[PDB]
Sequence to fold (1790 residues):
Amino acid sequence: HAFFKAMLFMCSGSIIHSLNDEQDIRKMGGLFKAMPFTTTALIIGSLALTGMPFLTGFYSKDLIIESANTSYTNAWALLMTLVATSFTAIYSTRIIFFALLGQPRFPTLI
Amino acid sequence: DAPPLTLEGIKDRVLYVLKLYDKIDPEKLSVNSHFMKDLGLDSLDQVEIIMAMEDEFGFEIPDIDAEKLMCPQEIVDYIADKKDVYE
Amino acid sequence: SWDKDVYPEPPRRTPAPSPQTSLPNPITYLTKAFDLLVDRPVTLVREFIERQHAKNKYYYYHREFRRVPDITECHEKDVLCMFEAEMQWKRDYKVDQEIVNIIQERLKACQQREGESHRQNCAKELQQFTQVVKAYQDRYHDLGAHYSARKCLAKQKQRMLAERKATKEAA
Amino acid sequence: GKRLFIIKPSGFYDKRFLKLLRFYILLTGIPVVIGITLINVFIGEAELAEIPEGYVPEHWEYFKHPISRW
Amino acid sequence: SKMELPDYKQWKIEGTPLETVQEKLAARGLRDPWGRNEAWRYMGGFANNVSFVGALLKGFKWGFAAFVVAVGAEYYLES
Amino acid sequence: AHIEPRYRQFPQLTRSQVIQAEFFSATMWFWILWRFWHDSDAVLGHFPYPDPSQWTDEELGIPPD
Amino acid sequence: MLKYIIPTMMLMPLTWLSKNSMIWINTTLHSLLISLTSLLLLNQFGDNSLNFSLTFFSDSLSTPLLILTMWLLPLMLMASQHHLSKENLARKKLFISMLILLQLFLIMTFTATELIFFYIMFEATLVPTLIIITRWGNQTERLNAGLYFLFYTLAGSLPLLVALIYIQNTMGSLNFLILQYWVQPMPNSWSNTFMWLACMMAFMVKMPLYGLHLWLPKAHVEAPIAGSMVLAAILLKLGGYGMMRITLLLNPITDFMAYPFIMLSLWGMIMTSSICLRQTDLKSLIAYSSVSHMALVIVAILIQTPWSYMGATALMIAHGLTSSMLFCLANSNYERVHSRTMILARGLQTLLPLMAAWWLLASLTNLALPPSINLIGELFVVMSTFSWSNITIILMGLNMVITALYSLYMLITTQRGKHTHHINNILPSFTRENALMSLHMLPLLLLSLNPKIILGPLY
Amino acid sequence: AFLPSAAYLTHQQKVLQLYKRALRHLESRCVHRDKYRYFACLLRARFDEHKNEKDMVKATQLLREAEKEFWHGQHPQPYIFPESPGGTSYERYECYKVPEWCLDDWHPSEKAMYPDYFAKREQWKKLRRESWEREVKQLQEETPVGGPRTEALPPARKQGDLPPLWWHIVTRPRERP
Amino acid sequence: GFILALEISNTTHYLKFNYPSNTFKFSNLLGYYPTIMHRLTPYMNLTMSQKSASS
Amino acid sequence: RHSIFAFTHVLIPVWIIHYYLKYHVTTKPYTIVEKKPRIFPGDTILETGEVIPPMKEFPDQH
Amino acid sequence: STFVAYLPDYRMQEWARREAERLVKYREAHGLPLMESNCFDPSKIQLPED
Amino acid sequence: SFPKYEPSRLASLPTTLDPAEYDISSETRKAQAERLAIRSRLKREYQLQYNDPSRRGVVEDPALIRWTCARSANVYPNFRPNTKTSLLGALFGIGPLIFWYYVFKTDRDRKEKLIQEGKLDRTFNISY
Amino acid sequence: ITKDMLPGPYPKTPEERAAAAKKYNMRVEDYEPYPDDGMGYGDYPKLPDRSQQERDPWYDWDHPDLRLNWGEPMHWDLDMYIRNRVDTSPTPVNWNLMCKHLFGFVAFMLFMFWVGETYPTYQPVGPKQYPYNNLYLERGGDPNKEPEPVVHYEI
Amino acid sequence: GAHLARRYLGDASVEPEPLRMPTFPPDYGFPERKEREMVATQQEMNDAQLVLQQRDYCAHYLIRFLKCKRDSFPNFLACKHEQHDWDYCEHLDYVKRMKEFERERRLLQRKKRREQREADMA
Ligand SMILES: CCCCCCCCCCCCCCCCCC(=O)OC[C@H](COP(=O)([O-])OCC[N+](C)(C)C)OC(=O)CCCCCCCCCCCCCCCCC
Ligand SMILES: CCCCCCCCCCCCCCCCCC(=O)OC[C@H](COP(=O)([O-])OCC[N+](C)(C)C)OC(=O)CCCCCCCCCCCCCCCCC
Ligand SMILES: *C(=O)CCCCCCCCCCCCC
Fold:
């Protein structure tokens, strides 16, 4: 988790620095082609965070879920673990949608 | 990062934004044209103008200073004072 | 060097290296570089320093204390004999503390050395630690910050009275 | 172009104090470290030995380092 | 230092979603006077951005081609 | 030199950063396709799962009484 | 102990025969020389104490306190020479003379083998501090502070004199070396109950106990800087030394007569830390922090275990150094802005950066950042109180949280934020103030390398 | 509410402030530009419907119910500008805003690095200390008996003198020091 | 989760306005945990500090 | 003097630390306690020279 | 700091460690228990009669 | 309608929902003018003391000295022992002391009773 | 300074109330002292108990960080109502509703955790089998005794 | 997870408890049943320092895999055959455990049917 979380933070800092210290995703967008390297790194990091197969997160997170399913476990804890996994997917693509896709929303001078 | 500003660039950008307004004929406005009198605009038009200039320059003008910004020259002078240009 | 009987250690058994693959391991090359660049100059410098140390030789000794009578053969309120007995008891208290430290160091060394099979192979060290801790607890515990030989004598007398009563009621 | 003066508090006195502190520490720190190195290399530490029969040591002959014995 | 702004006649709201907002308001009976101000975000290099699936599939063509080449090379190398 | 800022327009791009981004995206997709072509088991399943309802009572030692 | 007493009384002709401009230089130089000389007391043995004569001895408990006193005197000479700049020369020499006399009484107090000689020196220490507070203090209520301090101490200490004379008549000697071997159990009765109260209340007042602490946020506040340093750093530890020496005669009645003061001091530190959270005065905040730490030492002495005693003596030395440094920093702020209000002068890190670093280090040692000796003492006391009972860990954890809270509140209020607009006399830090801060800091940081010389007589 | 030059807020000022707050919060709810444009025009139509109302009690009740409507439908966290109060970079550079009176405590060794700047500083200070008595004499005769009524300051009436109380609002630190 | 949030973003893109629900205000305002705790616990502790201990 | 960082910051501290560990830390007992090496069947001990016997035959299933 | 660093065996700790090593070796060689539960000999102690 | 905003101690009523804000009566206008006059007079005093070129020190604020003297040196002259003060003092002064005393006494009695029967595991406890 | 600018005792007559209101620089109608219950407040004014966060941030305060003016009467708990401490700004949701919603969420989560602890999940498998009497000697049992033999058969 | 519903929503007389299993003799219905065979010696697992939860009935494949891992350095992808063999024998042991659970379930069902018949006559 250290690798892709640190690099997600670094790419978010790059987006913040390029838009004059703006940390709001409501004032972003259209950065898929304007900043291609940070876009590529953000997509790779969100895919590794969500648990895309054969990335870095696949080798730890899926084994955690596989061991949690086939064990003498609290039922409710397993249920909220699965729901939280779905929510991680949801906010990852929320970040990707509101920060890269669409039309620009940042101030006029670029 | 953070390119500098000048009065010429500030005036050009503020006149650009005011020129893209559909309620103002672009061949009539100038740097010292008034809003209520010389252009025939309501107070709501002034509020929307001030919000447009805030969105253009990326910083917020407070209301107690927004009510008194009535011609483009005062907007230029307010932005120049707030951002400390020509140093 | 130290004494290998007070601090025991089993003989080291290392396996032979078997290079199944043809890829050269970097550890052998790094060990060669370490012996060439690091071990040789440090060894030469230590040789020079030891040569300087061998020119003049002087010795320091371990202090020996003869046994004096203990607090059991001291008259009450006799400050000379009680003073000597108290000093002797305090010295033995310090030595007993360091004995418990030695056994604890033995236990920690066994636990680290035996690896994952430490629960089976460190039975003797655990038994020695348990015995020496029981002896230390029965000798010196619950005395307070103002411990003295009289307090320890009173504690031992109370424990002996309890043991005698227990063996009388079980007879 | 366009260099502006940066107003900052007077940093002269703080740097002067730090330089004085470093100089006055090192003025005896360097000779003491050199002397300790020369004591360790050339004089060296003592070697543990059993007491000869009939011989009583002085009270300073029970310590290892030369400086502690001194 | 001195920077030159582009022309202002070129910001026309036609072909953009602002034209759809214009016709919706015209059906209601209203107007947006600031529509030409926002018209830059919908034209030029900022037009026709990719979708989400196209964003995740960036560089899939060259990756797939390299995978096919490498698999064929491994197929030939084992013989 | 550096990048000149643009007003109200798409910003200037270096060819180097576009090449680097495309190369790393292609590397990621090549790696995923390669590891799925080779392993395909850490995602799909390693061993068959036997249903216990199909086991005969003889091999489980069930006495008919 | 005459090799330290005689140079101390020879400091008096040195300050009374110096020039009009060379009194500070001479006194500071020769006091630093005697402070260097004081290291010869570290000839301690694992079984026997260092017994010099019939009247004087020094074991491993009194030695750190002695070294702290003899090191603290030149710090007070360096600190107190700016606000006495315009004073008359004879009054300046009288001030230095009272400091010298106080140091003489303090070094004769920690080495007294007889208990009545310890009492006589321990109450001879009252006069120079009362004179310093009530003469060179700056405020109106310095007289009221002196009255409160004097009468709390004397009302606590007269039954101690009566009880010590009773012990002399009953046992036959007040020599501490004799009483270690001639001690007897003290049974449960009303007579022995009032014996325990009489022998303990003087040091409970001087430490102070919660409820008897009302003289401290007055004497610590209306005093000058040198007075505040010697009150926080040494004078609170006379009570700790007294309870460490006198608990030997009070057994086994301590095990149930110590319950009410254990409850007073366990709950008292929470109350004083909470008071520290809402203080408008910086000096009062430091004084109440001193009350909380001395409550910790009171609990450690009262539960009477080896770990508690080692933690108590280490915490005493560490709190003395830390409180002295904090009072010095607050005094520097007072000299700059001429007010003790904490909210007045803000944002001084933008103006005084190295002083802000000194403030940060003092605050970090106040909240017991490991491996400082503050944390060593506090940790050992926490372990021993956990051995006493388990809910003491709840009380100690709450105290640690509030301690970190008010220390960082001090630091954030004074140093951080936006600076005060209308204050424009913030001069740069002198070399004297920085040297004073470093002479408080560097021994405190160096003692973490060899912490075994401050761990009491049962290390 | 809290105004330097006025004791109250007029009705029109309240309406304009409500209009700006409602449009900002509607922009926060409607993050896309075209959607915000459409709903801003709807809000502008709603505000223009009751523009010509002469009943003061009815206009007051309309304003009160509009404020209730805004409070029911505000964003939980609206968009704040980075330098606006409550922003992410609000009062960030206050640690670097060293006041100008700290230059008088500089050592002469480090004052020699900027000779012309310190010469200009000296002539600025000479001008300030020359103009102070004139400006306080101007301010003394312009304040009515009973104290000033508002916080507005007068300008310089004649030629040569500077406006009263000018030093600490001219020599204030830059936004990015 | 990916499908659900893609549909959520597509519905966000529409030209409709809806008032916020209690679930949205619960999720956006961090579950009301800091707004309650950081206003309640310091209030009680500081009032106990001044009204009870200090005064 | 191009590569003084690999000399002043690595080689000199490596020399000092190796000296300190060889002649002052490994002299005292139980200072560097190292886990004994893992031994498998079929290995050969350096010190004794013995050969550890191989394990039993496998009852093959695959 | 130099004086404190080279203190001659402060409070006999190193001597205690050396003597503990000697005593542990001597007691381990002869099969003796390393420490007994009683500090003083029970033979030279007269318990009160009850 | 809309749910009415109920104010609390830790969440004040907003200034745009206050019914007394929209008051236009002449008494409130006179009050606001008087408050503005007081504020402007105090600001004039402060700025006169603030912009003086010949001043190098602290512009003393009598309000801050008043606040500190009220917080510190007025509490006992303005204290009268009555039912409320004595009740609060007995609740907050001897309440927690008695509670903690009984808690610690019960715990130590239980521990000391368990120790003397040999029911408490003290096998490796030699540090105290 | 003088002794007639410092705070005093509780005012009884309207004359001393007006004098105190003039002393603290506030109008007589807006000046309310604390109630005279003997707590020790004196005649210090009872200001409306609002944090400094509720002040106007765009006003030019004499003290900008504290949002405080020179000469203005200072609140009794100003060191508690600073921007670093307790906030009293209005919330988008009513305080009671946030309290009940948070408490209900925490209680429901605790109840369902208890229910899931009562009825756990598992897999249709038997116990794991280990050789050598369930690893008796490896688990620390002494070898001089002999354990009860744990025998695992095939299936 | 149908057995979860059959035990909780259904009845607990048929579904066996996992915490106490098996509740039947191993000779019940199994004539001349043999034991499992341990290949790895106690000393062989002891000196290879396997984890105590890792010393199950198939540790010989684990020892072979560990030797293959040690001898193939630095080729960390060198041998997956020993890992696959160990994993397959793990799968076989898991199948054995599933067989034991199903056997216990069927025995409990048979006993329930026997008591139901016994109630049907008596
Ligand atoms: C700072 C304020 C608080 C200060 C608190 C000070 C301590 C409180 C208790 C002090 C008691 C007085 C000294 C007792 C010394 C006892 C020595 C001794 O031998 O005791 C055994 C002796 C026993 O008598 P005896 O020893 O002669 O007899 C032989 C022994 N028997 C009895 C067995 C035959 O005790 C006494 O003689 C009486 C002791 C109790 C005295 C009660 C009166 C004083 C009450 C408290 C006053 C506290 C200060 C008040 C003023 C405060 C300021 C305004
Ligand atoms: C003492 C009671 C009174 C207290 C107040 C006293 C005031 C007056 C002051 C008088 C002088 C000072 C007296 C106390 C001196 C204490 C210091 C002392 O002597 O220590 C002896 C100790 C003695 O150590 P030792 O005991 O281990 O040495 C063995 C003994 N000999 C030397 C005989 C073999 O000295 C040291 O520990 C020095 C070790 C080497 C130097 C430090 C190396 C490491 C430094 C840090 C490296 C980086 C780490 C990571 C950092 C990360 C960023 C933060
Ligand atoms: C019986 O159901 C055995 C399986 C374990 C208990 C139920 C687990 C339910 C959650 C996992 C499946 C989720 C499918 C999307």
Observations:
- Helices of chain L lie at 26-50, 62-72, 83-93, 95-116.
- The radius of gyration of chain L is 30 Å.
- The pocket of myristic acid (ligand 3) is lined by residues A 69; M 121; N 1-2, 4 (CB under 6 Å).
